[PDB]
Amino acid sequence: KQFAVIGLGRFGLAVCKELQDSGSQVLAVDINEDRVKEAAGFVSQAIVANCTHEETVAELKLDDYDMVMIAIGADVNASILATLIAKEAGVKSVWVKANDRFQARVLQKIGADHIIMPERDMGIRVARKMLD
Amino acid sequence: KQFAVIGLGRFGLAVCKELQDSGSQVLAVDINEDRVKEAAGFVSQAIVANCTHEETVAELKLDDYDMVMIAIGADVNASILATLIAKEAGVKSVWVKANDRFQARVLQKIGADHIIMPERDMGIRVARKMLDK
Amino acid sequence: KQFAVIGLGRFGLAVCKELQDSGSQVLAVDINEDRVKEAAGFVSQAIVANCTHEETVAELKLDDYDMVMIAIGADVNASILATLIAKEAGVKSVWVKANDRFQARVLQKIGADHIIMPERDMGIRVARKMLD
Amino acid sequence: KQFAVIGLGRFGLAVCKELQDSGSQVLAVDINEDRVKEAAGFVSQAIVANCTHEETVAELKLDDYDMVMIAIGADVNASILATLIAKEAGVKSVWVKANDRFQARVLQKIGADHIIMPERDMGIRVARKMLD
Amino acid sequence: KQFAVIGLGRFGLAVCKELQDSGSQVLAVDINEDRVKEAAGFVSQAIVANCTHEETVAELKLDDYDMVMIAIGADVNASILATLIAKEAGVKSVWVKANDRFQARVLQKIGADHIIMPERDMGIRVARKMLDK
Amino acid sequence: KQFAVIGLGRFGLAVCKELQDSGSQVLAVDINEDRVKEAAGFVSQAIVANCTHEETVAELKLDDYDMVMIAIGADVNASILATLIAKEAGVKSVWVKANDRFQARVLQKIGADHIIMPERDMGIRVARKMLD
Amino acid sequence: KQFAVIGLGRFGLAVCKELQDSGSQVLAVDINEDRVKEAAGFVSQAIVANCTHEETVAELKLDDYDMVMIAIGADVNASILATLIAKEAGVKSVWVKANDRFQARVLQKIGADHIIMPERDMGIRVARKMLD
Amino acid sequence: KQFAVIGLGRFGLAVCKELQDSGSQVLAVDINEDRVKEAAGFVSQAIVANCTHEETVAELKLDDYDMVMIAIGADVNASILATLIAKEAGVKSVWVKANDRFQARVLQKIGADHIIMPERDMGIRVARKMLD
Amino acid sequence: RGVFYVPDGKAKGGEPRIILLSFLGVLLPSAVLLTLPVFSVSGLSITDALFTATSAISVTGLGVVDTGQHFTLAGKILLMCLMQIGGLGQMTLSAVLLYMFGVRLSLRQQALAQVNLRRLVKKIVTFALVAEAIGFVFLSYRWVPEMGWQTGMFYALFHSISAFNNAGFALFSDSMMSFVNDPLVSFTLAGLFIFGGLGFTVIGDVWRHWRKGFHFLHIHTKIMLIATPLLLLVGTVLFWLLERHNPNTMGSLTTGGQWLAAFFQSASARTAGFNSVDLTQFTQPALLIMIVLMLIGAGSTSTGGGIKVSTFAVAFMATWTFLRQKKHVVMFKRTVNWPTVTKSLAIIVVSGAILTTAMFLLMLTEKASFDKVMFETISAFATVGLTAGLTAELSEPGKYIMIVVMIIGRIGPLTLAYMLARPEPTLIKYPEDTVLTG
Amino acid sequence: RGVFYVPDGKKGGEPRIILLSFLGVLLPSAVLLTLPVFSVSGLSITDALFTATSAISVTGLGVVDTGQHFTLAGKILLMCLMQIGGLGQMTLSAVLLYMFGVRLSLRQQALAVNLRRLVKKIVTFALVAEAIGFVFLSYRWVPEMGWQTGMFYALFHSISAFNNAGFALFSDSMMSFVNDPLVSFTLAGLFIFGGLGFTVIGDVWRHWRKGFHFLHIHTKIMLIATPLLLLVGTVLFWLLERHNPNTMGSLTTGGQWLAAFFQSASARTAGFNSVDLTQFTQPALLIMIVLMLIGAGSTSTGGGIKVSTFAVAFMATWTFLRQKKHVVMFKRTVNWPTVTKSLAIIVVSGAILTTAMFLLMLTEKASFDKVMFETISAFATVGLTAGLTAELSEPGKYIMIVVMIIGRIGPLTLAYMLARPEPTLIKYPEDTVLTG
Ligand SMILES: Nc1ncnc2c1ncn2[C@@H]1O[C@H](COP(=O)(O)OP(=O)(O)O)[C@@H](O)[C@H]1O
Ligand SMILES: Nc1ncnc2c1ncn2[C@@H]1O[C@H](COP(=O)(O)OP(=O)(O)O)[C@@H](O)[C@H]1O
Ligand SMILES: Nc1ncnc2c1ncn2[C@@H]1O[C@H](COP(=O)(O)OP(=O)(O)O)[C@@H](O)[C@H]1O
Ligand SMILES: Nc1ncnc2c1ncn2[C@@H]1O[C@H](COP(=O)(O)OP(=O)(O)O)[C@@H](O)[C@H]1O
Ligand SMILES: [K+]
Ligand SMILES: [K+]
Ligand SMILES: [Mg+2]
Ligand SMILES: [Mg+2]
């Protein structure tokens, strides 16, 4: 019902658009204001915030939301740190977007619920769609 | 079924994994010798080449394969040029990976049979999976 | 008879000079402010803008202009994307300067009405000039 | 109608193509062997040689030819030197391609008969085609 | 006194050289064989291996060592991953060098006992020498 | 006890912080203005200047200060030039950070009074800590 | 007695310093104003001018100076054009500082009296000094 | 009678040419394969190597040669490193080419016996030739 | 704590809209309230109530009617609340917008490469009450014995609020004329609008970092801590010199009374409104000096002012930099960037343009000497409220114009500051051409 | 031809040239005016130096009557002095602008018409305009005054009007010609053209065929603002003075409009007053003060801050109020340094005017409107008096002299100090200061 997306890049914006189409309350959070404005009309609430900062995450009650997406791809360190703050903040389900396999090993092994590497996953399915 | 993969990045290597594990024979092309050596371990044929040159693409005989995959991500010029060369060669079906919508519509004008944009497609499917349907 | 010249390199200034001297009003667009200042002397209106942005082209109102020249030579991506955006903006006639035959076929397939290759065309005409 | 072309770039290949189509015997010189092989099928005679090397030019006997094309674009210094050697050898009429106005001014002041600037001339003539 | 050093960089060699001169048994691990040979004459035992591979670390038996030093600076992601493996292997004390404060803040939340930022630590420690010269 | 710290990087700021906290006035110099702003809060005086130019160092009056620290890490050439110019300026005690053994020996030959290699020294003293 | 040097780089500034210390009136001309400021104290008259421009060279009466030095090194076309304009203007003796063998060959073909190759002449000189 | 030249630029090629034409035996060391090949047409021994690494310096035994000439021009750091390692090896006499005065004085502090600045030396010598 | 904000949506400054509606959102309900006969003994006209409501919300203190008599006890309390809303409301509102402006700046810096708002508001309210409490007890020390327990506290608490808020409203027929030689009230009021017109940022910075010393204070704090005593000193000395020999207003005082009157007028010139001495019989050279003082105003985040002291300080040292032809404007070893220099210069030129049209209009609607017209226009625009006699004889069209001047002068410089901060971005830019100036 | 210059050597240096030129022309004139050959009765040192300052600064303010107190030799001296003031200021500004453009072009080349003919064109334009004014004025004054008196007054007043000096040979300046249109438009055209600027005249001369669109930005700004300023001044002066019996109430409908237009045109740094300013109402006095501040064109004979400066300030204020990123005039962006120059000129002029007004109210005892009007007139070089110049004291004369000197050279000097300041090798950190 209530969803939170951190990082409003290509992957984050795409998630928000479908989540709003299904009539669900989605929270979009991003460090860059310019990207928040792009997703402002596609989400219920749009906030410019730094999810690396522990106190900022505390105020935005992410534990109330059912699912949380960390969709930061450029900074390998920021995604790892944002995931670790979300888990200690009390988020039950944390989904993390990983760009490389080395990061995916860390995120899974520190306790992230779901690990998503967009380039690999279509790599599997595009092959499957060619096969059949 | 024989498949051709152009580009040996994260996407191309995943395609090679799945296709080889599915029992098919694939040919892998990349410009960097480091990536083709890793791919040579499992692919049927691994060749280092540039797919933006007409003669090199003609030597590879891409027209034999029913499905040709282009996985050039960083260089949009290389992706568009390789797609154009493959289409001019006479390959029946072309699948190309695109990073943004402008590249997607340029590939649409060129005539790529199927265009895959991993970021937005995973956004769509992850949203669907969160919606539990 | 209004013209729009996008790209103010060596080709663009020559086109603007020959167009203005013929009594027709032209619009000059470039990202380099120095070249816009150079063209501003003899051009009816000169604008510092990026034509690879779809919103920038929309407010430029290139659809009003009868014919649009895209004279971006160095950046192939800029030429391709400007041609695509101009065609998607519903402009009647698009003329594009191409630096390579691979670029020429791409521009033709996008939908550019006339494609100019300076080195090839000048070569053909110089060879013809040698005959007579 | 006997002609010679020095340098087999895009402009040089176009000149050779059109001039062979017109039905005249030509000799093409280029420092790179691959372009000589590409143009050998079209041109009457193609020899791999350097025209900044004076005894090579003397062997080539360029003074027999009515008109000569020097179409070296990348190296301005090579173009000026080739023009000087061609003029010293006794060529009645020399035509040289210039990429920049400074090179064109140097070439005119040293004594080149005709100066071809592909971008500008195409600029005026494309604009003239635009008018009608 | 049992010690292990992970990553034979500039910081790694300095740790290995000083610690061996005291008379302690030290293990030197590095992915690059060339830097292992340079440390061969300054350590008791040096093995060329990757410590981000889970199976390799079990062979090394890092649990017996009293202290482990992770001195990977170039790849911050490898430094984070190597710290997790040592903790999972049961190493009582893990010392990791951090180039940036962002990496250090992650490392503290991991559970690394000591976090070493050599450039900042010399900042106070050299400056204190200035006061009393 | 007047100190001058040239280069306000990770090492430089910590030196400035400790020196100022210990009750002494320090001078902070850096070419990156945004990095000068951070030090300007806790440093007696901060200056945006290039210390590889002789006249700039002359205007800085580094000769008055008791001790000068050069903490330029990435640019080896800049560190060498700063150390040399400081010695010509007439600084009594010069302390220079070194990132390489060849750099350290070059600085020693120039006349640097104290040479600090943070990685090597930190490794030695951390090894001492682990021993005890 | 009367010397004119165009280009106030490392070579031209040294020429000025030696010629004026010898006790002769020297004209230092450079397009960049900062170099003219640096060389202004040494030389009798310092002028910021563009010797690429024919009218400026005509106004600055270089034809009465005993010898004229063209010491532009970076731009080959600018140096060639300055030499050729100086020869056209009636300068009896023109010495040109050339950086490349192709440039030296072109200048020799033009008619420059003396050609100076800086590192090459040092090549022979230092070789002879090592030999004896 | 045995000489070693580090760096195969125009200065290095000229010094090798004159040393050979005077009848001496020279060793040419450089990093670029094309230039060491060009020197190999006439040098007694041509080795492609980097002179900033100690092991190669010890392997090719600079200490045997009486005179070593270091002609690294573009990279100041490479020239400083080559001079430092040459002095460390124990070669009696080191000659190094410097581009600017700061590099020259750093080299003098390091211990280079003779320092060559081609630009300023040409300046003085051509001024002397100008005088008489 | 949580440093975040919700973007307004699809990129021009909306803070000018926030300021404009906040001022109009309180003036209109206050205007209709004053029409009720419960607050006035005889009732007010729509124009008179609007002028009074504007003056109370703007805390200018200009009165078309006598405050002490025309208003009832309920009306006097109503005036008391409004000048809290005008002075402390702007001080809180400016601090809130300044806090949010920094938050947007901080997050954008993090993207490229402090207490919470509720906590900050508590200190602003706490500072206002404790300051008015100190003034209340000191003023009660004198007025309670003279007028009684209940009247003494009310007059003391009224004037403590008015002085701190830079309102200048007085419950006596003559504003502080009966206390020319009285130091207790003259200094208690003086301290109230000196610290009231100092800025919360200056008080807050000194409160939190006084131990580090003056050198490590913020640039804005250092400017206000030097210029305000400097302005008070030059105002006191220069008023004393030009008024010591004028028999009408200050010539009949004692030597200590000379300086007390001179200091009180200079302190109240910087947007307070109290006048220990009569301004009608106040010489022209001293009128110009007071006119300059009114324009210079109080601090940026204070209860009142015109253009602020920092705005005047930057332009003053920008001129010094220009005449010495320095590349950068420097104070306290800090460079003031060109956009800040442009803001300071733009506020002065825009204010002068507004003042000229306002001055021109008044001489058309009403007929009086120009020196009186300029003085009244500056007082309304700079929110000082010091009158020269033209206010009493104001006409109906003149009242409307003076209302607009009070509103524009109250919000103008702060609003124009934020328009310069965040202009609307454009994708189309025109070529630059040189225009001859000088 | 040759585009080159010799560097100064070793801050802005043209302010020094302007200041030394003004002082080295003022001092000899002050020395000459003490000689009794030029004055029938002789002048005091203070009065003579005040007259020299008014002549060189072409302010036209007179502590003594021009027609009576000066002899024929002195009258010719005044003509030469006001030529020097106006035409020399125009020529010096043109020469400095030419040298600035030369340095700009050379630095542009390094990064990536000659002066003599320009001076000849300035003198030719001045003589042609002055000859046209002379013949037009002689058409009227020669028949009524004689052959040689008629030519002399016509030439004198043509010189004064073109140079924007305002010196008149009658006891009351242009008071006797309120309803005469010939002299009114003859003088008006002279300081409208004289105050238009040589840059505008040259740009229209060389590029009128391409049309108004392809003219330079400064030329367009002047050609739009000058008629607009003239029209608004005429309309305001007609509206505010058509019911005042003392100035325009007794005149005819055409006469009222003629007087209003003449006052509007002469308020822009000319100095001629067809009507009396002593009996001039307060709002119209404020309007005329604003007009005097706005002044004439940049490279002209006028004074005060120039019309282009006021236009840039106006458009910048409009841009700020609309919160636009760039100041745009005629589809051209005005760069931030130019806006800063305009605003700084306004602020510095205002500060100087405030100090001067305070000093005058100290030394002299008069109402504020008179003191402010006189200060604006002296600083803006207009020279229009409101009855305070005749009652000046000696310290008042000194202060007015300083105001005239600073006003004549100030705005151009402050423009050129901003043009190329001292470079610095030491910079301090940037810190934010709250404004507004
Ligand atoms: N012209 C080309 N022909 C063949 N392969 C190419 C060409 N250009 C790039 N490639 C290869 O395609 C791969 C794509 O990598 P990248 O652009 O990083 O996307 P990803 O690695 O995410 O798939 C690269 O490893 C590169 O070696
Ligand atoms: N995205 C863009 N939008 C508009 N103009 C552009 C863009 N990219 C490049 N240009 C302009 O197009 C011109 C073509 O560049 P260049 O290759 O130098 O021209 P030429 O072919 O004459 O050499 C450049 O001057 C550049 O300013
Ligand atoms: N020539 C110079 N003069 C003064 N300061 C310099 C100069 N060159 C570099 N610096 C400063 O020295 C600092 C050193 O930073 P860096 O090289 O990243 O080392 P660290 O890892 O200690 O930050 C840089 O912030 C840079 O601004
Ligand atoms: N580390 C190095 N070891 C050996 N040779 C080098 C090294 N670095 C540069 N060189 C050589 O020194 C030569 C000098 O280069 P360059 O400055 O371009 O020519 P020149 O010095 O003649 O102007 C180059 O040819 C280069 O190959
Ligand atoms: K007030
Ligand atoms: K005048
Ligand atoms: Mg250079
Ligand atoms: Mg070389």
**Per-residue DSSP letter, I45:** -
Of B70, B90, B92, nearest to B81 by C-alpha is B70
Is F53 touching J (CB cutoff 8 A)? Answer: yes
Nearest to F105 among H76, H84, H106 (CB): H84
Q: F30 has which bridge partners?
A: F48
Give phi and psi for J267, each to the nearest 5.
Answer: -65, -25
Counting the structural domains of chain J, the total is 1
Say if CB G5 and CB G26 are below 8 A apart: yes
Contacts with J1 from chain G: Cβ below 8 Å = 55-56, 58-59
Distance CA J270, CA J256 (A): 20
CA dihedral I29, I31, I36, I38 (to 10 degrees): 90
Distance J380 CA to ligand 6 centre (A): 8
Length of chain C: 132
Atom in ligand 4 nearest the alpha carbon of residue H13: 22
Contacts with J11 from chain I: Cβ below 8 Å = 325
> Does the distance separating the beta carbons of I322 and J414 come in below 8 Å?
yes
The pair of structure tokens assigned to I264 is: 């009180």
Say if CB B1 and CB B66 are below 8 A apart: yes
- Ligand 1 pocket, mutate which of B10, B30, B119 (most atoms under 8 A from CB): B30
Which residue shows structure tokens 């000093």? J359
Say if CB J157 and CB J136 are below 8 A apart: no
Domain limits at I258? 15-113+115-421
- Distance from chain centroid for Cα A115: 10
Report which bound ligand comes closest to the CA of G99.
Answer: 4
Q: Report chain breaks in chain E, C–N > 2.5 Å, as residues after which they occur.
A: none
Say if CB A94 and CB A112 are below 8 A apart: yes
List b or e across D83-117, with b for residues whose CB sees 16 or more CB atoms inside 10 angstroms.
bbbbbebebeebbbbbbeebbbbbbebbebbbbbb
Distance CA J384, CA J192 (A): 17
Contacting chains of G (3 CB pairs or more, <8 Å) are: D, H, J
In the sheet where B45-48 sits, what is the strand order?
B45-48, B25-30, B2-6, B67-70, B93-97, B114-116
Of F8, F125, A53, F10, nearest to E99 by C-alpha is F10
Q: What is the enclosing helix (H) or strand (E) of I321?
A: helix I309-323
Touch between chain I and chain J (3+ CB pairs, < 8 Å)?
yes
Helix ranges (DSSP H) in chain F: 10-21, 33-40, 54-60, 76-89, 101-110, 118-131
Nearest to D77 among G52, G103, G110 (CB): G103
> Which amino acid belongs to residue I175?
S
**Per-residue DSSP letter, A72:** -
CA triple I139-I142-I145, angle to 5 deg:
130
Q: J333 has which bridge partners?
A: I432, J328
Length of chain I: 438
Distance CA E62, CA E43 (A): 16
β J327-329/J332-334 pair status: antiparallel
Distance CA D19, CA D25 (A): 8
Distance CA H123, CA I209 (A): 61
CA of D81, closest CA in chain G: separation in Å? 6
Angle at which helix J307-322 crosses helix I338-365, to 10 degrees, equals 100
Residue A110, marked binder: no
Say if CB J6 and CB G47 are below 8 A apart: yes
Of J222, J75, J225, J224, nearest to J160 by C-alpha is J75
Contacting chains of E (3 CB pairs or more, <8 Å) are: A, F
CA of F73, closest CA in chain J: separation in Å? 22
Q: From atom 18 of ligand 4, which residue's Cα is the shortest distance away? A: H74
- Ligand 2 pocket, mutate which of C13, C17, C56, C75 (most atoms under 8 A from CB): C75
Q: Using CA coordinates, name the residue in chain J closest to C36.
A: J332
Say if CB C70 and CB C96 are below 8 A apart: yes
β I329-331/I334-336 pair status: antiparallel
Say if CB H111 and CB H94 are below 8 A apart: yes
Say if CB B6 and CB B69 are below 8 A apart: yes
- In this structure, the number of other CB atoms found within 10 A of the CB of residue I25 comes to 9
Distance CA G6, CA I327 (A): 32
Counting the structural domains of chain B, the total is 1
Angstrom distances, CA of residue I150 to CA of E131, G113, I140, I142: 65, 109, 10, 13
> Does the distance separating the beta carbons of I371 and J369 come in below 8 Å?
yes
Is I216 touching F (CB cutoff 8 A)? Answer: yes
- In this structure, the number of other CB atoms found within 10 A of the CB of residue C58 comes to 14
Helix ranges (DSSP H) in J146-216: 147-162, 181-194, 198-207
Stated resolution in angstroms: 3.2
Length of chain H: 132
The pair of structure tokens assigned to F95 is: 């302390």
- Distance from chain centroid for Cα H76: 13
Q: Report whether residue H50 contacts ligand 4, using a CB cutoff of 6 Å.
A: yes
Domain limits at F80? 1-132
Is J110 touching G (CB cutoff 8 A)? Answer: yes
The pair of structure tokens assigned to A8 is: 């409003």
Dihedral sign of CA atoms C24, C25, C27, C32 in order? positive
Q: How many helices (H) and strands (E) does chain G have?
A: 6, 6
The pair of structure tokens assigned to I416 is: 């124009």
Within 8 A by CB and 6+ apart from F34, the residues are none
Contacts with I433 from chain C: Cβ below 8 Å = 40
Distance CA I201, CA I254 (A): 39
Angstrom distances, CA of residue D2 to CA of C130, D19, D37, D112: 10, 10, 21, 19
Task: Identify the three-state secondary structure at position J145.
Answer: helix
Approach to solving? cryo-EM
Which C residues 26-65 touch D at CB under 8 Å?
A: none
Q: Report whether residue H77 contacts ligand 4, using a CB cutoff of 6 Å.
A: no
Q: Is residue I102 part of a domain?
A: yes
Which residue shows structure tokens 């030090």? F39
List b or e across A99-117, with b for residues whose CB sees 16 or more CB atoms inside 10 angstroms.
beeebbbbbeebebbbbbb
In the sheet where D25-30 sits, what is the strand order?
D45-48, D25-30, D2-6, D67-70, D93-97, D114-116
β J4-5/G45-49 pair status: antiparallel
Helix ranges (DSSP H) in I58-114: 67-70, 73-112
The pair of structure tokens assigned to I361 is: 């209009």
